A paper describes a structure:
One such enzyme is 2-hydroxyacyl-CoA lyase/synthase (HACL/S), which catalyzes the reversible cleavage of 2-hydroxyacyl-CoA (2hcCoA) into formyl-CoA (fCoA) and an aldehyde or ketone. Originally identified in the mammalian α-oxidation pathway of 3-methyl-branched fatty acids, HACL/S has demonstrated remarkable catalytic reversibility, as it is capable of condensing fCoA with various substrates covering a wide range of aldehydes and ketones with different carbon chain lengths. All the enzymes are tetramers, specifically dimers of dimers (α2), where α2 dimer represents a catalytical unit. The three domains have specific functions: the N-terminal domain binds the pyrimidine of ThDP (PYR), the middle domain has a regulatory function (R) and binds ADP, and the C-terminal domain binds the pyrophosphoryl group (PP) of ThDP.
TbHACL/S was co-crystallized in the presence of fCoA and hCoA. On the other hand, the asymmetric units of CoA compound-TbHACL/S complex contain only two slightly different monomers (protein chains A and B), each protomer from two separate catalytic pairs (AA’ and BB’, a prime indicates symmetry related partner), which means each catalytic dimer is formed by the structurally identical monomers. However, in the tetramer, the two dimers are slightly different, but contain identical catalytic sites. Several residues engage in close contacts with acyl-CoA (R545, K546, Q548, and W552 in ApbHACL/S and R540, K541, Q543 and W547 in TbHACL/S) through electrostatic, hydrogen bonds and van der Waals interactions. The C-terminal covering regions are coming from the second protomer. These contacts seem stabilizing and augmenting cofactor interactions with the active site, likely extending the “on” state of the acyl-CoA. ApbHACL/S has stronger activity on C2 (acetaldehyde) compared to C1 (formaldehyde) and C3 (propionaldehyde) substrates, while TbHACL/S discriminates less harshly between substrate chain length. Structures of both TbHACL/S and ApbHACL/S with and without acyl-CoA indicate that there is no notable difference in main chains and side chains except for the well-ordered C-terminal regions.
Numbering used by the authors:
A (entry chain B): 2 to 549
B (entry chain A), C (entry chain A): 1 to 550
Amino acid sequence: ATITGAQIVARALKQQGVEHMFGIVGIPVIPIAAAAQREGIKFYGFHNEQSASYAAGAVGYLTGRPGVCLAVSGPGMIHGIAGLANAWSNNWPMILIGGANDSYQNGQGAFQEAPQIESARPYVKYAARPDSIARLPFYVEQAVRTTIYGRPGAAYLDLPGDIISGSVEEAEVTYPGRCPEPPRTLAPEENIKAALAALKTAERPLVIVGKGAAYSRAEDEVRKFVETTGLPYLASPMGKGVIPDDHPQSIAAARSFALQNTDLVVLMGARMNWMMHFGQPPRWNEKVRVIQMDISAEEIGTNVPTEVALVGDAKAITAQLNAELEKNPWSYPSETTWWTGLQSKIAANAATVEPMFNDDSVPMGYYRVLRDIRDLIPKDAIISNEGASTMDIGRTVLPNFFARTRLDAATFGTMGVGAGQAIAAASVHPDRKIICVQGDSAFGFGGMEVETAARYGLNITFVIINNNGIGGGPDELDPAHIPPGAYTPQAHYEKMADVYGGKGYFVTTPDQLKPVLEEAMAQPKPAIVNIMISNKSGRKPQEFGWLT
Amino acid sequence: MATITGAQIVARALKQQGVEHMFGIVGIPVIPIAAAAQREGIKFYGFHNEQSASYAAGAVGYLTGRPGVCLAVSGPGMIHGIAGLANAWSNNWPMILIGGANDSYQNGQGAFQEAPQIESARPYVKYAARPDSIARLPFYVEQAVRTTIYGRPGAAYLDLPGDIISGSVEEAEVTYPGRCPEPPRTLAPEENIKAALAALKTAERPLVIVGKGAAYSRAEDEVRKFVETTGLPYLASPMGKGVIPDDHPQSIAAARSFALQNTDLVVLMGARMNWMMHFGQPPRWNEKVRVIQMDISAEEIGTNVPTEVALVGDAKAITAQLNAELEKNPWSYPSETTWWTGLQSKIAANAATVEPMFNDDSVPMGYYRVLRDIRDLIPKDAIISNEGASTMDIGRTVLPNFFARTRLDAATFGTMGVGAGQAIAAASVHPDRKIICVQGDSAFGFGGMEVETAARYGLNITFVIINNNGIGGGPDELDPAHIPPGAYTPQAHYEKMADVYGGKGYFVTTPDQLKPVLEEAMAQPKPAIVNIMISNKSGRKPQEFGWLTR
Amino acid sequence: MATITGAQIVARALKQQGVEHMFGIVGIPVIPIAAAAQREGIKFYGFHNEQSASYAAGAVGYLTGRPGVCLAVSGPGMIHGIAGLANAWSNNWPMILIGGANDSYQNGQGAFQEAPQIESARPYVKYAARPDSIARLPFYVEQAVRTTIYGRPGAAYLDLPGDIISGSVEEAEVTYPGRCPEPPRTLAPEENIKAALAALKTAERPLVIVGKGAAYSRAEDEVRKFVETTGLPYLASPMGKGVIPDDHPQSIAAARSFALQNTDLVVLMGARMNWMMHFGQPPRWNEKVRVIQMDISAEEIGTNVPTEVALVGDAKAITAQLNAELEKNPWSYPSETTWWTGLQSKIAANAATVEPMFNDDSVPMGYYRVLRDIRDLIPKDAIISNEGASTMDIGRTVLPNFFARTRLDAATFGTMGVGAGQAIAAASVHPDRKIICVQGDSAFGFGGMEVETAARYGLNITFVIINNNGIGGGPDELDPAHIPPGAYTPQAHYEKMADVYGGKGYFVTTPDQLKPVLEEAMAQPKPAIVNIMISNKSGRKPQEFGWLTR
Ligand SMILES: Nc1ncnc2c1ncn2[C@@H]1O[C@H](COP(=O)(O)OP(=O)(O)O)[C@@H](O)[C@H]1O
Ligand SMILES: Nc1ncnc2c1ncn2[C@@H]1O[C@H](COP(=O)(O)OP(=O)(O)O)[C@@H](O)[C@H]1O
Ligand SMILES: Nc1ncnc2c1ncn2[C@@H]1O[C@H](COP(=O)(O)OP(=O)(O)O)[C@@H](O)[C@H]1O
Ligand SMILES: Cc1ncc(C[n+]2csc(CCOP(=O)(O)OP(=O)(O)O)c2C)c(N)n1
Ligand SMILES: Cc1ncc(C[n+]2csc(CCOP(=O)(O)OP(=O)(O)O)c2C)c(N)n1
Ligand SMILES: Cc1ncc(C[n+]2csc(CCOP(=O)(O)OP(=O)(O)O)c2C)c(N)n1
Ligand SMILES: [Ca+2]
Ligand SMILES: [Ca+2]
Ligand SMILES: [Ca+2]
């Protein structure tokens, strides 16, 4: 009895916990997608490997197991490099399976012959071309384990066409057991005590909850830590939901004031990178003290020195903090000038955005549109929010009540992930509603994938906030001097719903928002809501821009 | 106010980060770097080839837990140093290669020694960076140092253009980070600690393997207490020798092939299941062997063979967890089992086989007769640089180590060319110790010129060459039309190289010369070279399996 | 029928492709490759370090127009050989590095010397490939050879796993390509030939520069006929020396800085406007200089300075076009111009400055006094391996070359470590010639062990060391607490290294020793080593500009 290399890899992937595969078929990976379906792996055929590679990385973040992207040789694999880099930037587990020309045709100028290993090298923790068919399960298990052990990351498997279509005896093939979950590593006890001792000396302490705690499934231990200590906390863009965004101790409406004045910050799975302004002045105080919790030891002390390094798993380390807090109880006083200054800043920004929510001007503004979107999103729904102002204002206006329920451009600030991450969320959570909120430019990067979501019957609603271009476009286009960031004025993107027989809606006035969004979200097929806004609407004014 | 050059900034930053030694060769454009380093108190060693200097930097990283620094000129100087980057990459040792580069405003012009040096170092480094400006040089130095010692230790590369080295900025606009502290010693979950000890109590033929990862973690005291308390048989890796003294009664080194082939549960303390351990696979292991793996690299867990209990973290801290759990729940392996009896029987058989080889006075001499006098005259706390094939492999079993991190060999990469460089690195780290360099005649040739480097800097090194006329032996006379590829000049008098620097060189052929020559040579104020001729038929003890599993 | 191993296939394919020499060091897994190569008639040279062996392979490529082959073991052996790949990359010389690799079925296991060797060689090679199967080995060998010599010549790398080397296939399923013929000598458009000659007739101060690209193209006869017919002044690049005999009356080598600074039109015959020619930019050139560029690489045209007439193609064929067009439309530069007068005046001034330096009998001696006796005793057709800084730069101007491709120096990459390797390469290519190796004391240390390699293979090489106690000089006594970074042991007796292989070593300090020592040394049946001490204050002739433009 024989078995093909495609049937070996599909059986090895399924045994290693792979349940979702995204990509596009063709020479030579056609039998791999067929064998994947026979093993129970759900395969999603995309319209471009770029979006499919982004969807695989989102699965790794949502599940702790690598999403798999399948691509053909040459240009197909290169399109999927975008997913490798995005998973590399966010430390997400992901595997790109790229076909390759037959091994005995190397050097001949074979069909789509390309240096695919060296192309994937800068963004992968692991890259391998399996030497033989019988050893395929070795490479599948080693790639899966490398993506999820240590600091999570991406891997690339280079499959020549003759390894895929060739056959061996089943008795030759050894299959490793399913890769167990890695051990949740602890921090030394003297560091746990030093972290709590430093918190007792702080006058203006602050907790920052990043998506590292979300990936670590640490939402329970993190909330118990914040509530026991009574510390004010700031959630990162994709860290919101780990603690419900309606929590009384959130200081999200005073973000700039909190970062600028805190004297001790606890980074719970969050990097002091561009998203946190490198922890440097003027966005921070020059003498801010840092307690850093991260599984990557190399990340400790980046840009600003770390006083207490907590290297290890976020859930296990936070469990250490809560256990020591039970032995020596401590909590931050609820009546301090730090709290008074924080709440005073929260009330000032609350009154600033209050009239924006109730502004019925036409063309509409961001806050008026997102208010009706916010009030219709189910509490357990997954939010795919992409764009510039559409994503930034949606970050503050759209709350998350559970961890790992927001997917945005993330660390790499990538446009082109919206529809793919929405499809990834739908595959992981088939019992939930997926709300995709994109800017008009962000929608164009992968707009064809709305047919992909409809083809597989995914419960996704596509909302487009349109201001006629990248950060806005004019109402009329001078055909001689077209602004480089502008698109066709009032482009009817909702008409793309007619491609697959869905319902598209065009919205310009505030009275349409609530009935259109409610009706579109109840459609059996994915609906597209195209909402026009003024090219002059913007976020709440700030002392500092987000790009330091 | 006052200004400062990039070279002086780099030297000051390196000194703040704990760098005391710098090995390399000067030239355009890194001359002021070595000058400023000596001005700061950093001892610079001028080698004869950057290849040997880069190997020395990686050995300093293993011996100290702090990155050894190699300084190389642009182009071919940095490329010569990639060998050391790759060797530190293979052994997970901390080191920094500081390579000069052509002036940035001359890129694309065909500048002097213009080369893609970042991309050349990329496959073997955890961190490669060209500092963008002179003022941010301390940022890159601290980031490189921290990346080499945090997490799984490894190599890094700093690409310094000439204008960044020779240019100047005001001192007021330069910020120096604090000295990078040692990384936290990571613990394993207490459930895994109990699971590892509970698995040991189910094993009928358990085995402990002590690797050089436990040596790098400075975990010798915890590793010894663990093996003594449990009473378990233990095997030392080639550079794991010394963590527990090699004369320990629980060592089964003389029954290595038997222990690996019959153990049912092995505890890997800082050692990989790579080519050295035959991938943990049959026929060298049992196909159902259970593994307790202790490693700082989570990605290493489960390689080749599955791991039953994973102990991810620092060896010293995790071994302290095992010892603490043993004091709470005592247990020890019995001293009277059939496992001990089979191990002791195999030890006595291999001891009887090699016993007459130690006393064979035949000329040309054999490995065991020569290594016997080296073993018995070496200071008990000396540091051994052992390199070659049979010279290193037989020297591994014959020459014992009683302290951790006192043996330096070809290591995981099996590299020829590290012998003299690692001996120089050991001397620079331990100036109060005697360094013994035991190389085969071929391995000595890879970096033989560096004997003058050791003499120039007054290092307490004694060079011993075990010469069989080539790579694994060569004939006594050479056919000019049929010279074997691995042969050298018969009776090559390498000891005459001691006359280059005014040292003494010895030529040994008969056993009556061994003891008086080695005694006088080791007492010389200059590095002596003892060229000992051996038979080209001499080889190691016969084994059922070769060391290279394939 | 009969079977054949991959090693025997590689050796047979290399022999068919014209490979006669193979330099390197054997070991796992490339032992049968060197054995099969010797079985085929390929002469194998066992070096002491692959670094020097890889430099030797590139020198063979320059001397023959056919790729020199370097054989290296897996891991660190191949990484040592990257230095030669980079040197061939910098000089556009054909060479192949054949590096072994671990067994393919052991990838990912931590196999012996497992390393990303393709990616390590990538930045410096035109072609890197791991043969997919044993039967297709001749395909990869011919493709590698052809890629090294077709187009702009360069380096290539072949990654051979151990199982591909030791495995066997039937001979019937192996196809061997024909011997790769020499590439066609490409012509320039006849409109560009006329445009180049018409531009020459408008120049008031024209200059011809002969580079080693014209030497590689075997274009010496056409280049000499071109310069003689036109009567133009010509300057020879460092390794362009010998294309036209250096005693030619039209050479303006003694007025180099004046010629470059005042020429209004230059003809580049196989020479780049890189760091050697100071990028063709002021202050070393006039900002309005016109350029006629002759190069096989179209991408090189117009680098740094614009090219008025582009002559893309083979130097020999294009120079033959210029000579053919000159016979059809005769022209020559007049022998009586102010340009000639200024050049001749500058030559006589520099000759008068260095004339007493040649005759200075002061002790410690100077460069010019020592190089005078080397120049006057060298055989007129000898091949010179000159390496170092001042030793190489002054030796470039003092030691003349009368035949093309008879000087081998640090070349474009300015590499230290090529001296002995290139001397061995020259001897292997020209066994009927005397090879003279003139190195500084520092450059000798980079590959000093290879003197035994030259002696073991009976090569007619004489090693001369110009010793000033370090890199650019060192003190007479060393302060143990303040050793300069570029200093070595004072009065280091490197000549004692000749006693390693039974040769004769000489120590020279006074001028009365120069002539009798050099005469006796060059007549020795074994490679002699002449260690000549010079003053640490001796330097080259004073110049207005330094050689390093920055
Ligand atoms: N299981 C885990 N436990 C702890 N930290 C983790 C874990 N997984 C990833 N991390 C770390 O969390 C950090 C996330 O940083 P970042 O993505 O910048 O957060 P955010 O963007 O939400 O601020 C990464 O540095 C990563 O090393
Ligand atoms: N501080 C540390 N604590 C625990 N393990 C470590 C530490 N530093 C390195 N290691 C691990 O030790 C292992 C050493 O394995 P190896 O070099 O194969 O040892 P040997 O060659 O002696 O068998 C590496 O895999 C490395 O991840
Ligand atoms: N057969 C050939 N015909 C013409 N030009 C060639 C040939 N082979 C190589 N070249 C060119 O000659 C040039 C040599 O330049 P370079 O090495 O800088 O010479 P030098 O160092 O002597 O100035 C290279 O740019 C190369 O492209
Ligand atoms: C791959 C990629 N290409 C380009 C960009 C730059 N970029 C950031 S936001 C954006 C589009 C902004 O327009 P839109 O999404 O419609 O948002 P809004 O106008 O509401 O801000 C672009 C092109 C990017 N981040 N990623
Ligand atoms: C950089 C490098 N080049 C080549 C080799 C191959 N190699 C392994 S051992 C050895 C030399 C063996 O001879 P010697 O050191 O004299 O020891 P002996 O076995 O003869 O005692 C060589 C060249 C290597 N391991 N590393
Ligand atoms: C591979 C490499 N390492 C280092 C250098 C830097 N370098 C240039 S010349 C030189 C040695 C100069 O001394 P020596 O050869 O003795 O000549 P001298 O100038 O003293 O006559 C060195 C180390 C280099 N060019 N290449
Ligand atoms: Ca927009
Ligand atoms: Ca030997
Ligand atoms: Ca010198």
